[PDB]
């Protein structure tokens, strides 16, 4: 079977950014429901079980560019007193709607904490070594929820 719309696709991957390896793993996604980054989805379209390939995904097709207005300062008064602000730690904030907003603290300067709301891989081009381990047709419940079961 070939990778296409409404197919649950599981694949192994390893990600190269700037010639360095940053993660490697295995995951399954529902194809065609905006669950994978566009470039990777376009790359996997039409592939058949067992295939393997390299794929270059520019930032536009993967997690987008870095927004400079995605960086601002929030007082430490807003962080959990129990929790520690340290460059690299990640917390959640809330929008006016109350929907969550992830963040990564970049630096702490006393009362002032500098944080980035951008995706950690914004403005970063991606290199993938990917093999397609399995394709299957999705189940009704997965289609009703828009995501693959596991």
């Amino acid at each position: 079977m070939k990778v296409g719309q409404d197919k649950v696709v599981t694949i192994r991957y390893t990600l190269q950014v700037e010639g360095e390896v940053l993660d490697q793993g295995e995951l399954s996604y529902l194809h065609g429901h905006r669950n994978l980054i566009p470039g990777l989805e376009e790359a996997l379209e039409g592939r058949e079980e067992g295939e393997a390939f390299q794929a270059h995904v520019p930032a536009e097709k993967a997690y987008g560019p870095h927004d400079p207005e995605g960086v601002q300062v929030v007082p430490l008064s807003a962080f959990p007193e129990d929790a520690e602000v340290v460059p690299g730690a990640q917390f959640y904030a809330q929008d006016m709607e109350g929907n969550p907003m992830p963040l990564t603290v970049v630096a702490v300067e006393g009362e002032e904490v500098t944080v980035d709301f951008n995706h950690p891989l914004a403005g970063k081009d991606l290199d993938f070594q990917v093999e397609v381990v399995k394709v299957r047709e999705a189940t009704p419940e997965e289609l009703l929820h828009g995501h693959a079961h596991p």
Partner: peptide
């Protein structure tokens, strides 16, 4: 705003 934010392989948040 950040359109692709929560997409796999590496989703940011939950």
């Amino acid at each position: 705003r950040y359109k692709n934010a929560k997409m796999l392989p590496f989703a940011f948040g939950a």
